[PDB]
Every structure is written in C-alpha cells, then in structure tokens.
Paper text:
Both are classified as pseudokinases due to the substitution of critical residues within highly conserved motifs known to be essential for kinase activity, and both are predicted to function as scaffolds. Consistent with these findings, SgK223 has emerged as an important regulator of cell morphology, migration and invasion. To gain further insight into the molecular mechanism that drives SgK223 dimerization and oligomerization functions, we solved the crystal structure of the PsK domain of SgK223 and its adjacent regulatory domains.
The structure was refined against native data to 2.95 Å resolution. SgK223 crystallized in space group P43212 with one molecule in the asymmetric unit. While the asymmetric unit contains a monomer, the P43212 crystal form revealed a two-fold symmetric dimer with an extensive buried surface area (BSA) of 1620 Å2. SgK223 dimer formation is mediated by the regulatory helices from the two monomers with the αN1 and the αJ helices from one monomer interacting with the corresponding αJ and αN1 helices from the second monomer to form a unique ‘XX’-shaped four-helix bundle at the ‘core’ of the dimer and positioning the PsK domains peripherally to form the ‘shell’ of the dimer. The most notable feature is the absence of a structured αC helix, a critical feature in bona fide kinases. Instead, in SgK223, the conserved β3 Lys1024 from the YAVK motif makes H-bond interactions with Gln1048 from the loop preceding the β4 strand. The structure of SgK223 clearly demonstrates an absence of an ATP-binding cavity, which is instead occupied by the side chains of residues Tyr1008, Cys1001, Gln1048 and Leu1152. Residues from the αF and αG helices and the end of the A-loop contribute to this interface by intimately packing into a groove created by N-lobe residues Leu994, Trp989, Tyr1009, Ile1025, Phe1054, Val1058 and Val1089 of the PsK domain.
Numbering used by the authors:
A (entry chain A), B (entry chain A): 944 to 976, 984 to 1029, 1040 to 1064, 1082 to 1158, 1208 to 1217, 1239 to 1335, 1346 to 1405
Amino acid sequence: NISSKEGTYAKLGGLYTQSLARLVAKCEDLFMGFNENNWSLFKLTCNKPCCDSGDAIYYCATCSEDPGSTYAVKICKAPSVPVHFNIQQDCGHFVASVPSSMLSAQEQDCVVVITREVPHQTASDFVRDSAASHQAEPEAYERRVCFLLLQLCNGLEHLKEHGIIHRDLCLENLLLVHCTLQLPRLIISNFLAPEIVSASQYRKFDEFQTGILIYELLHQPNPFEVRAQLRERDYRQEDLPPLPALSLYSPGLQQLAHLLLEADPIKRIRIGEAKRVLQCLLWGPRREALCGTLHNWIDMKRALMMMKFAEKAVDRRRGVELEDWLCCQYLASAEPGALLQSLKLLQL
Amino acid sequence: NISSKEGTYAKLGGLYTQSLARLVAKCEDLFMGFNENNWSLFKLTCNKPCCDSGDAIYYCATCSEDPGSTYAVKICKAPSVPVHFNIQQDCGHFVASVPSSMLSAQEQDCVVVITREVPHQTASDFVRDSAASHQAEPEAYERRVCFLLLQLCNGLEHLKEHGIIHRDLCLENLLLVHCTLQLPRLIISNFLAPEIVSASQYRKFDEFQTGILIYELLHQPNPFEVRAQLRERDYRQEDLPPLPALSLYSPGLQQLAHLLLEADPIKRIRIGEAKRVLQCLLWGPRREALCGTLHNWIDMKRALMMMKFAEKAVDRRRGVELEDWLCCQYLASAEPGALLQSLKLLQL
C-alpha cells in the first residue's frame, strides 16, 4: 500500500493528527496532576505575602497531610468548578481571624480559601511594571499579551461551558503563576423584581470585558472610561479608539478588541472565536479551494512541531514549555475552515 | 510556495533528513561524552572482578583526580585508536604486581590497562548463559544477536578505516557494557621472510571471522571446527552448514554468514555491506523504478521515528535508548539504492 506516493503522504498526514492529539493528552498530564478543623495541618512558609489582588491576599503554605507540595492561602478582603489549567481550584474554606498587618482594629475576620496554585503576581501588577518594556521592546510584550489572552480565553470558555459567567473580569483578578516542566500560567480567580440585566447579555459578557482588558493589557485606558460618546450613544466598532501600531500584533489586537466590543450582543464574537484569532496571531497563517493550501500549511506546521519535540527528547536542557503545549493545542485541532474564519475576522 | 501539495510534501521529506541527521548528532553526544606514577590516584571498588575474558580480567576502580565517574582496570594475562562508541578506549598502561588470587606463585607481573568502560560480561559469557532462552524465545534472542552484530560491524568498520585489522576476533574479546540514557553496549577489546598471509587477505579477514561468530552467537559450532571438508577442500557457500529455522532472522542470518564466509577474499562481502544487511533484518523493508516505492518507505519510517522521539519528550519514563540511536543511524542514511543492494544480498 506504500507504492503510491501521495497515498503514503496522505497516510502520514493522518498520523500527525494522531500523534499531536496524543501529545496534547500527555502534555495535559505533565502540567496538571479541608475544613476549619483541618487548618491545624497547615503552616505558612513566611510572614510576607506572595501576591495581593485587592480582592484577596495570598500566602504560601505547606500541609503536613500532603508533604512535598505547597498550597496558597487565599485571604479574602470581604467582611463550584470542574478542574482546568487556567481556573483557580478551591480546596476548602473557612472563617479565620487575621492580624490587620497581614492584610497589606488589630485583627479582622476574613474568609480563608485554600488554593492549589501559588501566584507570583497579578495581571495588573504585570501591566504596572512593564510600561517601559512595552515601549522598548513592543513585539515581545504584545506577543506575551496574546499568550495571556489565549490562556484567559481557554479559562473563560471552560467556565461558560459549565454555566458560569464572571460578572467582573479585571486585571487584578488574573493571577500569574510560575510554570516549569518565561511565560507564566494564567489563572482566573474565584469570587419578584426581574433582573435589570438579561441572561442574554450575560452570555456575551466575558467577551465584552475581555475587549476592555485588551486595551488595559496594552497600556491603554478603558475606552468607556475616557470617551463620553461611548457611554451616552449607541456606538459602533468604528467609534472605538485605536492602538499605537508598535508591532505586528497591534493591528490584529485592535481588530480583536473591536470585535469583542461590538454593541449588539448577538453579532458580537464569541470567546471561542477570539481564541482562534489569538491562535492565528501567534502561530497561524500570515497574510501571504484555498483549503488545500491551508491543508498543506497545517501539515507542514505539524511536521515542524513534531520535529521540535523530537529534538527536545535528546536535548538535556531544551524541554517542553507551556508555549509548546498551547501551540500543540492549536495545530492538533487546526482545520482549513476555521482558519479561514479567523483570517477574515482579522479582515485579512 | 506552500500552494503545491507534493511540493510541500517533498519539502517535508527533506526536513526529515535534516532533523534525523541532527538527532544522530545529539544522540552521539548523549551516549558518549595516566602512568605508573598516577596509579596512586586509583582505588578498586571491591575485591571481586566484574568481568573475565581469558585475555584479561576486569576490576572497577575510582579516580581521585576524576571524582563521580568510574574506570575499568584491565589486567592482562600476558606474561592506538580514535574514539568510537564500540571501541575500547585505553587511557594509559603500566606493569604491576598482582596477587594470583585476583587472576580468577603467589603473585604475577601483569600489564595493567586503564579502560573507560566497565564491562558486565563478555559475548561468550552471554552465549554460554542463554541457550535455554534461545530455545524458549528464538525471535527475541536472534534479534539481540543482530543488534550485537550491528554494533560489532560499526566498530570493525571504524577500525578498518584507520588501518587496523583485529587478527583474532572471538566472543571472549567482545565486551558487553551496561548503557542507559536491556540492550547492552558492545565494545571491541584491544590487544627478510615475507608474510605467510598477504595484506590482501587481511583486508577481508574481519568479515571472515564475523561469519564464524554468527554461528557461535546462534549456539552453533564453528563450521571449520566440525567439517573436515571445509579445512581440506576449496569450499563454496553451498557447502556451508545451515541454521535451524527458529525465527524470522534465522534465514537472513544464515545467508549473511555464507556471504561472509565466501572462500574468495575478493568476491566476499565487505563489513559495511554486512552492516546494511543487519540493518535490513532489524528495521529494513521486508519481502512485501522500485526506488520510488522505497523512497516512500524511507519517508514513512522517518516520520514514525520522529513520532516516537516526540512522544518520548513528554513521557516521564519512556526515554531514548541505544536501539533508538542505532535505528536513527539507519534511517538517516537510508537510500533506495543501498536498500536494494541489501535486499538481494538477502536474496529477496
């Protein structure tokens, strides 16, 4: 059966799909895997917080029942999910009494949640400290923004699939976690009169907030917080402010923001389409029966991906990174149809 | 340029060749990298020998100048090479006085050579202890024999290229060494009247001895040691004894032995051709402008090889083995021409 050239090479093209799905499965294995009475088992590692997100403050802790691993103690300032890589996992909660010095009269009652992932900083912290870096090296920063946004989309989509809408997404509530075996791991933190806001508009709400976040990540102000015409009039995507063209990602990110900030909650782009767009900005086909051409591109990108992984197996300090995983997720589900969707969403 | 299907897939076919050559280079990195006065630096680990080859006895030792690694002390019973994976590397020598108890009147003067590789056993030891195993599970054993023979060919070829002919190859002088990061690593140990034996016949001598070794590895006697007609007459390959057909490798190994034992030292098969034949027996095309068909086979085998390596990069205890390296060496230099050579040498 190996006599026909393209019969064999069409046979190969299927086995790239095969391995890539297997690679994603194993990569998922790699990067992944209490009550008020059980709190005795815990022990804060130090007196300093590792992260402060306004909504809560974080302290690394160890558990005597679980030696070798570390937990994050989330102390909420306020007076249910299936597991995902980009979603904060709560392991139990209670009410404790905390010295006011730890929250930055002598003590306050706080809700204490036990988190599996220890945050290095928040997204707002990252934005706050990277203005000069964005100015100096725009392409590196804006690519990083696309990676964070991609992870954010993965989390939001997993939340939406199981009936959860985060009523307020903000940079302060997006946790950046260290990740090995550099690009951080993004994690979305947890929180008869009819409703003033319908369930319909809540469905396309994460998309709307994400559009605002794109501005905030690229060191631009919230458009509605600066332009009164956007608060008072029925605007259109043309009315939305632009971004300084500093790199290859700036136009595509501006386009994506406009697509996410469309006033009509029906013609607005879903979160899964935004994901595919970010994917296109990162690895996807650039400007250069078109499906056949795309089929070739997918096959070539898959072969080059398998090549990078194969060379990592024999290199003693090149190893598998989060970027490799995310890139595999894209190429494994890559189809010429969906790529076309994303290409003219980017109006290319 | 990615518009044409087979233009792209012919573009891929070149990049498999690219990576595979790179994989071989890095695999080579992985599996690879004194006087009488310096002997003070050394220290035998224990009182027991780790290997006895008749020609010499081996003792593991440590060096104070080189902590963390182990050396093998080769004590020769007798009263210059470039580096290769299958060739014993001497690091210095001298004459020492050894208690006669260590050689298995109270002491004897022995030549002591410092070896980089610590042997587990010899090939004859392996043959001696595996008769039942060969009887019980023939295919596993005979495949192992092909792997050892392959490594032996790699060593002999590297020796011949640099003007060295091992005047006596025997199973006792072939050292099996442990190898990680199971299939052992084979290592070839070191040693006016005109010459009775010409330089011409010495050129095809390693091939002749290898042919005898094939019989000895498969638990069969040396043909010349059992058949008088072979010692007294000008025999032909038809006169050479057969092997019991116990597995898929038995006919091909018998064929290879006959090819190596051809009486005429000119029509005899070289050591490099025997290598390609063993390669064919292990991974090569089986019985099922034929170059185009072979091109497809090479490309498919390369893609499957890159797949195995890529899946090893994300598997925490599947890792790169010696068999993977040897298989890469074959596929990286695989050409339809040379494969045809081997296929009808196996009279297929």
